[PDB]
C-alpha cells in the first residue's frame, strides 16, 4: 500500500543516468513503432499483387503480355517494399540494443548507489533503533527489496514504453487508415474481456474446491499417520485404508466434474474469441464489396488494431514491476533519509586530550525502548574517581549493565547527565567517545578473519609488534603460538571454534590495542569455566591500574580488590564503599555474599497408467484432429484473402466470402467439439490414476513397520506432503501437456505438409529460418539464467559480510569501525557493479539479435515469396498460406518449451512415488504367514534381550533383559528412567524384533509367529490415548476389527471402563463424535474409552504404559480404579509411574541399564533395601 514519489525514487540518477533513460526510452518508442509500420507495408504489397491478380485474371486472352507489364509492376514494387523491410530490421537492430543496454546501464549504476547508501544507513542507526526492529528481516530487506527496485528501474521501463508505442501507433494507423473497422474491433473487446473474466471466477472458486476436496481425505491421512502406532496396534490398516479410499472416490467425482466444466470453459472461450475475429474480418470483406476499402488496407488496420489492442496486456506486467519497485523503495529510502540523534558518523563535538577519567552519573532516569511499560533506573547517583575501579553489584534487574550502555552513549538517558571528566558525554564526539572507552562484554564475538585482524579491529593502524604486545599483555600469546598458522588463524561461527576463556582474551587484546582511557567490564567473568576464569582474570587486573574502570559481574571474587563497590535496589543506588564497610553495613551486599557462600526413464508409471488402454486413444486421435484442424483456419484465411486478391471478376467474390466464413464457423464448432474431448479424456484419465496412486501409496505406507515412521526424514507432515505432491505431479505429466504436445506436433505436422506441397522450396526456406530463430530464442534464455545464477552467487558474498555486520552490530558499534564494514561492503559490490555493466551490453545484443532475426526472417519470407517464385507461375495466395501455417505451427511448438518443467517436476515426484510402493518392511503386517496358535492362556518370555532403537543406535536401552509372567498375574515394571520401562511393551507388540536374544509368549517365539495374530491378543493402553473423529461407539468398537462389534458388546466395554456416566449424559450418547472435531472432553474420558476399546478385544494380555501420566486429582483415582478392575483376570504388564498403585502387583521388576536388577513381590522388594526401596521412599516422602 505505501509507495514513493516518482522523482524521489530516481534521486540517484544524474547526468548520464538521466540521459541513458531518455535515449533508451526514445529508442524504445522507435522500436515499438516499427512493427505497425511493418504491417503497414504488408498492405501495400497486397495491393501490388491485387492490381496484378485482378488484371492477370481479367485477361484470358493474352499471356506473353502478362509477362511484361505485370512482372514490371512487381519488381519495382517488391524490391521497394523489400528495401523498406531490410531497413526496418536494421532499425530495430540498433534501437533494441539502445533500449535494453541503456536502461540496464542506468539501473546498474543506480542500484550500486542504492546498496552503498542503504548499508551506510543501516550502520548509522543508534542502538535504540535496532532494539525495536528485527535484524533478520532488515538483512533480508537489504537483499530482496533492492532486487525489486532493480527490476522496476531496469529494462522493464523501456519495455513499457515500447508497448505503449505499439498501442498508440497501432490505433493511429488503425484510425487514420479507417475509422470504421477500429470502432468495430473495440466493440468485440468487451466480449473478449468478458470471456477471459469467466476464468478469473471459475479457477479461483474451483481451485479452492479441490483444496477443500482432498483436505477431507488428507485429514483422514493425518489423524491416521499421527496415530499410526494405535492403528498398527489394533490392525485398523484395512479400515483406515478403506476410509481413505472412500474419500478418494469423492475427490475423483469432484475432479471429473471440474474436468467437465473447465474444458467446456476453454472451448467456448476460444470459439467466442475466434468468432469475434471472424466477424471483424468477414465484416471487413463486406466493406470491400461495397468498394470503400482495399483488400490490402483491410489487412493493415486489422493487424495494427489487434497488435495495438494486445499491447495493453503486454504492458500491464511492467506497470506492476515499476509499482512494486516504488513500494519497495519506500522502506529503503525511509532508512536512508532517517537522520539519528546520536550518529557516530558525525564529525562534530569536542575531542578532549589528556583525559584523566573522572566519571559521574547524575540523577539518571532511564528506560529501554520498552518505554512506559518498565522503568529500570529510578534515579541514580554514582561517581568514580580517576584510576579507581568501581564495582557494581545487584540482585536482579541488571541495571548494572545499563550504566555500561549509557557510558558508551549507546542511548541517551531520559533525565540526567553522564559526565566523563567535567563535560557532559553529549558534547564529546560519539566516535572519539567510543575510542576512549574500551569494552569487554559477557559473550565475546570474533569476526570471521584472522587473530591479527580481530585484534586489528581495535585499531586499523597497528603492526604485529603491537598485536604481539597486546596478546602477550593479556596473557593470550602463549596459547595461540601453540595453535598452528600463528597469528594467521581463522575464527568465526564457521571454523576453529575455541574455548570461551580463550575467546575472551582475544577480545581483551582487541580492546587493549584501543589503549582506552575508560574501561567497561560487564559480566566478562560470568558464564565461563572455573579454571580458565583465573587466566582471564589475571589479564583483567593487568588491563587496569593504568585506567579508570567500571566493572559489573556476579563473581564476588573480582570485587574485593575494587576501590569502591556499589549496590542497587530497584534502580536506586543504595549502598557504596569499600568491602569492609559494606560488610559492617550488613545490607544488600552482605546479603548476597552469604547467599553465594534422480531423473530417469520411468516407463512403469505409464504402465500403471495403462489400466486405461482407451481414454488416451480417444484423446490422442481427437488431439491430432484438433492439431490438423488448426492450420486449416489459416488455410481459410489464406483463401479468404487469396480468392479475393486472385479475384478477377468481382461478382463471384461476394458469394464465396459468405461460403468461406460459413466453413470456418463450422470448422470452429468441430474444433470445439474436438477440443472438449481431448480435455475431458485426459482429465478423467488423470483423476482416476490419482486415486490408484494415492491408494497404492497409502497402502504401502501402512505396510511399513514402526522402524520407518520413526525416521526423522518421514514425519506426519512430510508424509502427507509427499502423499499429495507426488500424485498431483504425475497427473500433470500425463495430463494437459501431453494432449498439447501432440496437438502441436500435429499442428505443425499437418501445416508442414500443406505448405511444403504448395510452395516448392518456399517452405524449405522457412524451415531453414524458423528453427534458427527458435533456437536463438532459447540460447538467450539460457544466457539469461546463467547471468542470473552467477550474479546471485557473488552478491551473497557482499550480503554475507553485511549479515556479519548487522546481527553482530551492537558489538561493532562498541568497537566503532563501522567504516570498516562500510568499505568491505563497498569493495564487495565493485565486482557485481562492473559485472552489471556487461549485463547491459549482453542483454542488449541478445535481445536486438533475436528481434533482427524476426524481421530479417520475414524479409526473406517475401524474398522467395516474390521474385524467384512470383516470376515463376507460383501464386501470392500460397505465400500467405505458408507464412501463417509455418509461423503459427512454430509458435505452437513454442508451447513445448514451456511445459518442459512440468515433465521433470513430475518425474522427480514419480521418482519418489515408485520407491515408496516397492519398499518392503522387516515386519510386514500384511503377511498372512504365521502360526495362529489355538491355545488361549498366555505367558511372556524375555530372555537375554538386547535391543537399540534403529534411529539412535548409540545409547542402549535394553541389554541382557530377562522376564517372565504367568497368566492372570500382574507384572509390575519399575525403571530408573527412559523407555526401558516402555520398550518392553513395544517388543511384545512386535513393533520391532530385538537385536539379540528373543521374546516368546505361549512358548513360541513371536519372531516366527504371525505378526497380526500376536497383536490381536494385546490390550495396549498408552499415556496419551488418541481417538479418531467418529462415534465413541466406533472408537470403542475400534478395538476389535475383522468383525463389527455389537452395541451391547461395546456397551459392556463402556461398562467396564467406567466411562458410561458420560455415554448416557451426552445428548447423542454412544453416537457422539470425539476427536476435537465434533465434541471435546478431558483426558480421563479419552483414557477410559481407550480402556473400553482395549477390552472390547477381550485380550489375554493388557499393556498399561504409564496410563496415569497426564492426569490429576479425582480423575487419577477413577482411572486406576478402572485399570485395577481390568487386570487381575488377565495377564498384565503395567509400567505406571505410580508406585503406590503398584503395591498390589503379583511381581515388581526394577530395570537397571537394560538389565533386570531387582525383582520380587512388593513386601519382598521392600524387605530388601535397594532401588525399589528407594523408588518407593522417594515418592512417599515427596
Ligand atoms: Br475466415 C478467417 C479465417 C482465419 C482467421 O484468422 C485466424 C487465423 Br489466420 C488462424 C487461426 Br488458428 C485462427 C484464426 Br480466427 C480469420 Br480473422 C478469418
Author numbering: 30 to 626, 689 to 1273
Q: Which sentences did the original study use to describe this structure?
A:
The multidrug transporter P-glycoprotein (Pgp)/ABCB1/MDR1 plays an important role in multidrug resistance (MDR) and detoxification owing to its ability to efflux an unusually large and chemically diverse set of substrates. P-glycoprotein (Pgp), a member of the ATP-binding cassette (ABC) superfamily, is one of the most promiscuous drug transporters in nature and is capable of binding and expelling a very large number of substrates from the cell. The structures highlight a high concentration of aromatic residues in the transmembrane α-helices that form the DBP, many of which are directly engaged in contacts with ligands. The binding mode of the environmental pollutant BDE-100 in the DBP of Pgp was also previously captured by XRC and it was shown to be a potent inhibitor of verapamil-stimulated ATPase activity of the transporter.
Individual aromatic residues were mutated to alanines on a background wild-type mouse Pgp mimetic mutation, C952A, that had also previously been shown to form well diffracting crystals. The ATPase activity and crystallographic localization of BDE-100 in the Pgp mutants were compared with those of a parent C952A mutant control as a basis for measuring changes in Pgp function and shifts in ligand-binding modes, respectively. All structures were determined in the 3.98–4.17 Å resolution range and adopted the same inward-facing conformation as wild-type Pgp. The ligand occupancies for site 1 were in the range 0.5–0.6. Furthermore, we detected no significant differences in the binding pose of BDE-100 in site 1 between the Y303A, Y306A, C952A or F979A mutants. Not surprisingly, the corresponding mutations of mouse Pgp used in this work were each still competent in verapamil-stimulated ATP hydrolysis, albeit with differences in ATPase kinetics. Increasing concentrations of BDE-100 alone did not increase the basal ATPase activity for wild-type Pgp, the C952A control or any of the five aromatic replacement mutations.
